[PDB]
Amino acid sequence: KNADLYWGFSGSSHHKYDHNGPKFEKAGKGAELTNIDAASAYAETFKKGVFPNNKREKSDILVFHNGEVKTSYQINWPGEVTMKLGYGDGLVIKDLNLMLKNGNMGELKATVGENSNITLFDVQEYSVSDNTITVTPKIPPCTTGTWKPWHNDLTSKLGSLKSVFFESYTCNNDDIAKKPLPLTVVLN
């Protein structure tokens, strides 16, 4: 009848000072910012993320309610949220669309600002246990040069300087923390 999506966005969205990573506000249409202690289905995925050294004590997680599932899986959520990057004006992220196929392909797309069909990340793999899907993003190894752990659609929409929150030249802990966290989808 529905699906709930749980996502911490990135480890860098959990800095002690919220200007230092993506910050979310004004969740609506089924999206909700929820304290991790009240989003237990995401507890184990959240604990395995790469977080900045100066990490927030109590974290909120994005939870998107009332998703529509077509079962391969095709899931769409009506939720919308505002993402602020540093001192910038907010950008609305909405129309989250997750496609999953053959256990090892698919992608999470969204409308970001005025641009629709923006792939946020490709899927490396996913598994289903009971009524829960665990979705792992496809992230290149951080080796040398420019490291880009999110899809090019996202950073090309954001531009060079807002993409500082989504890419790095170096492989330091706080840069690795910028990568997308995995998703937990609970089917009801």
Binding site: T144, G145, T146, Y169, T170
Partner: protein, 142 residues
Amino acid sequence: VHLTPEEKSAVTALWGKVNVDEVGGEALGRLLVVYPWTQRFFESFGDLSTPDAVMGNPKVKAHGKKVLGAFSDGLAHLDNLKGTFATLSELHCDKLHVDPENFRLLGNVLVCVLAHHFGKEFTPPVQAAYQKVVAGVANALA
């Protein structure tokens, strides 16, 4: 720059043993690693993400040779560095907008590279003479 004949002698003797294929690349590479905002001027050189990528970059080595060539040109005209470096001064200021403090930093990194290559032979008197030369080149470029 005013060097005594003995200081000019010490400078010329050490300069003759400099490996012209490496020292320039090492000084430029170390400038980019130690004073990392200098990488802004060389963005087109490619991978400068780590010290190893910087030092091993073929464009850093080739450009470093050109820089060393200019310091050598300064050794030929110590009594008219301003006139000799006139064209380069115009290039680095009017076109490249390099703050002149970076010229002093590059001269000091070159002194460190000479010390690293020559060891005990880069004695305190030999360094003192090179300090007059690198200050003269940096002032001429400014």
